[PDB]
Scaffold this active site. Sequence first.
Site, PDB file in Angstrom:
ATOM      1  N   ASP A   4      -9.892 -40.708  12.654  1.00 46.10           N
ATOM      2  CA  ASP A   4      -9.161 -39.445  12.334  1.00 46.10           C
ATOM      3  C   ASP A   4      -9.847 -38.627  11.238  1.00 46.10           C
ATOM      4  O   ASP A   4      -9.774 -38.928  10.012  1.00 46.10           O
ATOM      5  CB  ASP A   4      -7.789 -39.892  11.769  1.00 46.10           C
ATOM      6  N   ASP A  29     -10.228 -31.834  13.619  1.00 43.12           N
ATOM      7  CA  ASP A  29      -9.304 -32.995  13.403  1.00 43.12           C
ATOM      8  C   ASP A  29      -9.239 -33.866  14.631  1.00 43.12           C
ATOM      9  O   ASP A  29      -8.502 -33.613  15.616  1.00 43.12           O
ATOM     10  CB  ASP A  29      -7.886 -32.422  13.122  1.00 43.12           C
TER      11      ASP A  29
HETATM   12  C1  LIG Z   1      -3.469 -40.301  18.405  1.00 36.86           C
HETATM   13  C2  LIG Z   1      -3.118 -39.029  19.229  1.00 36.86           C
HETATM   14  N1  LIG Z   1      -2.642 -37.973  18.320  1.00 36.86           N
HETATM   15  C3  LIG Z   1      -1.485 -37.277  18.666  1.00 36.86           C
HETATM   16  O1  LIG Z   1      -0.778 -37.526  19.665  1.00 36.86           O
HETATM   17  C4  LIG Z   1      -1.160 -36.251  17.622  1.00 36.86           C
HETATM   18  C5  LIG Z   1      -1.329 -36.527  16.260  1.00 36.86           C
HETATM   19  C6  LIG Z   1      -0.976 -35.523  15.340  1.00 36.86           C
HETATM   20  C7  LIG Z   1      -1.208 -35.814  13.899  1.00 36.86           C
HETATM   21  O2  LIG Z   1      -0.462 -35.510  12.988  1.00 36.86           O
HETATM   22  N2  LIG Z   1      -2.317 -36.569  13.665  1.00 36.86           N
HETATM   23  C8  LIG Z   1      -2.729 -36.972  12.327  1.00 36.86           C
HETATM   24  C9  LIG Z   1      -3.182 -38.495  12.493  1.00 36.86           C
HETATM   25  C10 LIG Z   1      -2.225 -39.355  13.363  1.00 36.86           C
HETATM   26  C11 LIG Z   1      -2.762 -40.195  14.290  1.00 36.86           C
HETATM   27  C12 LIG Z   1      -1.937 -41.024  15.112  1.00 36.86           C
HETATM   28  C13 LIG Z   1      -0.535 -40.891  14.999  1.00 36.86           C
HETATM   29  C14 LIG Z   1      -0.039 -39.979  14.039  1.00 36.86           C
HETATM   30  C15 LIG Z   1      -0.858 -39.194  13.260  1.00 36.86           C
HETATM   31  C16 LIG Z   1      -3.839 -36.185  11.644  1.00 36.86           C
HETATM   32  O3  LIG Z   1      -4.219 -36.769  10.381  1.00 36.86           O
HETATM   33  C17 LIG Z   1      -3.197 -34.853  11.305  1.00 36.86           C
HETATM   34  N3  LIG Z   1      -4.178 -34.005  10.564  1.00 36.86           N
HETATM   35  C18 LIG Z   1      -3.452 -32.932   9.925  1.00 36.86           C
HETATM   36  C19 LIG Z   1      -4.352 -31.900   9.342  1.00 36.86           C
HETATM   37  C20 LIG Z   1      -3.460 -31.636  10.661  1.00 36.86           C
HETATM   38  C21 LIG Z   1      -0.448 -34.253  15.779  1.00 36.86           C
HETATM   39  C22 LIG Z   1      -0.306 -34.035  17.119  1.00 36.86           C
HETATM   40  N4  LIG Z   1       0.230 -32.742  17.454  1.00 36.86           N
HETATM   41  C23 LIG Z   1       1.182 -32.047  16.519  1.00 36.86           C
HETATM   42  S1  LIG Z   1      -0.176 -31.991  18.818  1.00 36.86           S
HETATM   43  C24 LIG Z   1       1.033 -32.442  20.019  1.00 36.86           C
HETATM   44  O4  LIG Z   1      -0.104 -30.580  18.557  1.00 36.86           O
HETATM   45  O5  LIG Z   1      -1.448 -32.538  19.292  1.00 36.86           O
HETATM   46  C25 LIG Z   1      -0.554 -35.032  18.049  1.00 36.86           C
HETATM   47  C26 LIG Z   1      -4.401 -38.564  19.911  1.00 36.86           C
HETATM   48  C27 LIG Z   1      -4.484 -38.540  21.284  1.00 36.86           C
HETATM   49  C28 LIG Z   1      -5.625 -38.084  21.941  1.00 36.86           C
HETATM   50  C29 LIG Z   1      -6.735 -37.613  21.235  1.00 36.86           C
HETATM   51  C30 LIG Z   1      -6.639 -37.648  19.846  1.00 36.86           C
HETATM   52  C31 LIG Z   1      -5.482 -38.041  19.155  1.00 36.86           C
END
Ligand SMILES: C[C@@H](NC(=O)c1cc(C(=O)N[C@@H](Cc2ccccc2)[C@H](O)CNC2CC2)cc(N(C)S(C)(=O)=O)c1)c1ccccc1
Length: 375
Positions: A37, A221
């Site tokens: 990440d 990101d």
């Molecule tokens: C893992 C999954 N991420 C997701 O499903 C996913 C994760 C986040 C999210 O908050 N991810 C976190 C790390 C983080 C990682 C895992 C769990 C929680 C937070 C990251 O540090 C955020 N970075 C902030 C600076 C924006 C946000 C979103 N969205 C709001 S979206 C729907 O608009 O895309 C989806 C994923 C799927 C496919 C490809 C990449 C990431």
Amino acid sequence: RGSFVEMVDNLRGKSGQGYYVEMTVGSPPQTLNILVDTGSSNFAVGAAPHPFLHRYYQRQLSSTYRDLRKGVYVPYTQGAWAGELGTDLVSIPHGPNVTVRANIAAITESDKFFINGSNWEGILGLAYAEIARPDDSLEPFFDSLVKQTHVPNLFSLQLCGAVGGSMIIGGIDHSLYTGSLWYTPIRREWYYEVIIVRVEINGQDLKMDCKEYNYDKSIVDSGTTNLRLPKKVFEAAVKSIKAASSTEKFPDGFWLGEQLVCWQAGTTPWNIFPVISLYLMGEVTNQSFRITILPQQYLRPVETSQDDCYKFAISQSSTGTVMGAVIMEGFYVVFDRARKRIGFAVSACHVHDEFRTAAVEGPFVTLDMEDCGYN
Ligand SMILES: C[C@@H](NC(=O)c1cc(C(=O)N[C@@H](Cc2ccccc2)[C@H](O)CNC2CC2)cc(N(C)S(C)(=O)=O)c1)c1ccccc1
Ligand SMILES: [Cl-]
Ligand SMILES: [Cl-]
Ligand SMILES: [Cl-]
Ligand SMILES: [Cl-]
Ligand SMILES: [Cl-]
Ligand SMILES: [Cl-]
Ligand SMILES: [Cl-]
Ligand SMILES: [Cl-]
């Protein structure tokens, strides 16, 4: 074979639920699957049983674990977790040939963070210390690696969508891209912040002031799935995407990510949807370049086996532009921390068809780009 061959194909992903690399913690070794990440800066591992986790870190079995006698809590845009801070020995077996003592948060409770079926059990925050919890004194993992060893201060990601890819640590592997790499400055070392100076849909400039594209920041990101755009930019881009795909209409909920559309397997009419270009500030005054993605990147599969269902994965943000996996799956992206810049080239694994490919093109002339950033 290139010198970094042993790091090629070191990432995995299960059904599009995040790209992870194997990391080995403690002594004797415990290997876990860790989500990569670039949108956060804490390294944290599941450390107690959870129904979504196959493996977790067992601190009591590691003789080299040190307790930092401090708790930590990290909320993200999606999900949050709490746990305990300590340090331990960490190596990446299909990464650099080094072992470092790094900070590690052992996650003991969480809400909407772990994802069922994703196969990953912790997170590697690769951004800078300014955004770490509890504060910027907690050295992030990549900072530990560069301080303790002679691995060059750079890494590169090739995320291969539908799932796997490569994280090359300490260099660039030329097998993973075609064409030339083009670089944009890292504006500030906190997130990987960049400046977008123009947006086109199907070749048509959206013609918003560039300050709107970066209000209040734009970042790269790998932990966020979608391309997320500030309200005014999201609404304008959807209106233009609709105008450019008017051989078919789709229910309004499809463009809000609320509805899926499915096509008979292998028949999705990619040509009816437009390409989308982001222009980024270049390395020379008044010079920019563009990266262009296809609908194969911004329509994401949702896994009958004779139907291919998709979700539209451009969405709204109240915290700036987030160039998530929808953008990174088009490109080999080089996080050149030593030279404070991010490189993009067309990925050798990006999904495309016989008519169109993703592209990185330049140079273009774009004046007054220093006005586009938020202060
Ligand atoms: C893992 C999954 N991420 C997701 O499903 C996913 C994760 C986040 C999210 O908050 N991810 C976190 C790390 C983080 C990682 C895992 C769990 C929680 C937070 C990251 O540090 C955020 N970075 C902030 C600076 C924006 C946000 C979103 N969205 C709001 S979206 C729907 O608009 O895309 C989806 C994923 C799927 C496919 C490809 C990449 C990431
Ligand atoms: Cl949430
Ligand atoms: Cl220590
Ligand atoms: Cl190495
Ligand atoms: Cl070492
Ligand atoms: Cl190199
Ligand atoms: Cl209006
Ligand atoms: Cl969302
Ligand atoms: Cl101009």
